[PDB]
Design an enzyme around this catalytic site. Structure first.
Site, PDB file in Angstrom:
ATOM      1  N   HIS A 131       0.806  -1.212   0.000  1.00 29.89           N
ATOM      2  CA  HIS A 131       0.000   0.000   0.000  1.00 29.89           C
ATOM      3  C   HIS A 131       0.843   1.268   0.000  1.00 29.89           C
ATOM      4  CE1 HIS A 131       0.669  -0.121   4.427  1.00 29.89           C
ATOM      5  NE2 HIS A 131       0.567   1.190   4.310  1.00 29.89           N
ATOM      6  N   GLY A 151       3.971   6.225  12.120  1.00 30.77           N
ATOM      7  CA  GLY A 151       4.111   5.535  10.851  1.00 30.77           C
ATOM      8  C   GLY A 151       5.012   4.318  10.918  1.00 30.77           C
ATOM      9  N   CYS A 158       4.544   1.547   9.606  1.00 30.51           N
ATOM     10  CA  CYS A 158       4.307   0.636   8.494  1.00 30.51           C
ATOM     11  C   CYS A 158       5.627   0.132   7.936  1.00 30.51           C
ATOM     12  CB  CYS A 158       3.483   1.319   7.398  1.00 30.51           C
ATOM     13  SG  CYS A 158       1.890   1.961   7.949  1.00 30.51           S
TER      14      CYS A 158
END
Ligand code: XWS
Lengths: 300, 304
Positions: B44, B146, B148
């Site tokens: 993503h 963040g 990710c």
């Protein structure tokens, strides 16, 4: 979703070495061309009770010190003693030496410990210096020679060295300059840690953390005076709260708008009435191993 | 004894620290795992801000060329030479093989099992913590903004077993992710649409191992004199939101049962009394909570 975190241990991993004096084996901190380790590695089975460390030291030869860094062996050149830390100077500088500084911490401040066994790193954990100057940790949380550290902008601040496992499931040790934390000696004699207490500034920091994460049920309209809080807190085995700690909580007070003595009325009320089956940040217990600056680090 | 005042430890994160990189596609920056000549990251990263509800990853990916991907390893820039997708993991082939690549495997875990997470900002490691795959296939993680691309791992004889990658924060404040082959844990999709985690439950098998660990170290106040049938235990546990116990979990605990001489089902009756009475101020192995994030594998390994 708030969890306790230890520092990335890579920069300290590449410094652990295995120091062996006669029969005794333990961990060393290899930095530049010096290996640091507890001075009781030289204790025999007959001096282990009442040793005169500096005179025992001056009589050992360099060759009685085994130092390996994995498979490679290190040559001991000289040895001196600084307080309870042994300093073995080696012929090779550690090319994995990070940028570091020796610091001494205060009871209630946090740091990570890299647990090691015979020079080999085994695990890492975050902890706090307890007010009785001990650190929670079993024999499985790393034995003698493991070190405690903080990382400040890729610079390691070594603050702690494990020396001995106390019977109460806690361990004790020194700073990297050899000075013990708390009233302890490196002599195998009956030795007990003082009655512990909850780190009061940290609980407040943790309550500020809940308020940043929108957990707000415990906040009340009340304030209290500093010692009208202290009196109640010591009856629950909470550290008394000094004017230093208030100031340190200032920045958190300004981001959330909860004055320090207001939050003190919330914690004081939490102490007398409990959490009544509710939760703060997922726990039914108050956390006291988050310093005010661990919260600002992780929340900013 | 051995485990008095015991703390959970994350594995030493050094071998992973030397694999973390910063992956950027246009306006998004997140973490990648650089192992040998390929860097892995959540797919993503190629989404825009309009694409997050219903991204067509195969449409999006084929429109991207190698030189739209910005891979930063500390201060060096890595050249992307190829790029394919395996489920939800994006795979960027780079010209340069990571010299700091450790011995590594890719493995998928089941809920209840544990591993460490190296939480990262923008390629830069910030912290490490030990956790368990919860029964609802989420990870109760740190309030990092963040994370990710942060990976989960175990380390066994110099060999790093990568088992988790962080893809998203759920509204409930926990994290969801995939294995290093890109398959999510649980019924989650890498879409910004309404997704809720099922009701969490206590990993019962882990608690029992923890209780067996206490008994090994003389901590003994919670034991009772009762046994229970397996199905009588399971039925009470569930109204306390505890995982049901399978015969497999009974077998896993067998080694602990034999070293203490406490039958598994007896330990289950002791647990059942702990649930109706509670630990209000009392301690087991220095913990005022019932630990459910310490597996039987680490207990028997560490208490021989
Ligand atoms: O944790 C947050 C939440 C999830 N995530 C995301 C972005 C695009 C599409 C699907 C998920 C975001 O990048 N990171």
């Amino acid at each position: 979703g708030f969890r306790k975190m230890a520092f990335p241990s890579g920069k300290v991993e590449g410094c652990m070495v295995q120091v062996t004096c006669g029969t005794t084996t333990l961990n060393g901190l290899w930095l530049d061309d010096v290996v640091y380790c507890p001075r009781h590695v030289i204790c025999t089975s007959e001096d282990m009770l009442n040793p005169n460390y500096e005179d025992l030291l001056i009589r050992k030869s360099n060759h009685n010190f085994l130092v390996q860094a994995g498979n490679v062996q290190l040559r001991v050149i000289g040895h001196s003693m600084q307080n309870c830390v042994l300093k073995l100077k080696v012929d090779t500088a550690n090319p994995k030496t990070p940028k570091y500084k020796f610091v001494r911490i205060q009871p209630g401040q946090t740091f990570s410990v890299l647990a090691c066994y015979n020079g080999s790193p085994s695990g890492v954990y975050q902890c706090a210096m307890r007010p009785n100057f001990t650190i929670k940790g079993s024999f499985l949380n790393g034995s003698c020679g493991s070190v405690g550290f903080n990382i400040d902008y890729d610079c390691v601040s070594f603050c702690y060295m494990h020396h001995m496992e106390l019977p109460t499931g806690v361990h004790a040790g020194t700073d990297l300059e050899g000075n013990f934390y708390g009233p302890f000696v490196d002599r195998q004699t009956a030795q007990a840690a003082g009655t512990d207490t909850t780190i009061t500034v940290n609980v407040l920091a943790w309550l500020y953390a809940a308020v940043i994460n929108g957990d707000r049920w415990f906040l009340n309209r009340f304030t209290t005076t500093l010692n009208d809080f202290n009196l109640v807190a010591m009856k629950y085995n909470y550290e008394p709260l000094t004017q230093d700690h208030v100031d340190i909580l200032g920045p958190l007070s300004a981001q959330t708008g909860i004055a320090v003595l207001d939050m003190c009325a919330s914690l004081k009320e939490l102490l007398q009435n409990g959490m009544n089956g509710r939760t703060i940040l997922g726990s039914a217990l108050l956390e006291d191993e988050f310093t005010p600056f661990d919260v600002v680090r992780q929340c900013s």
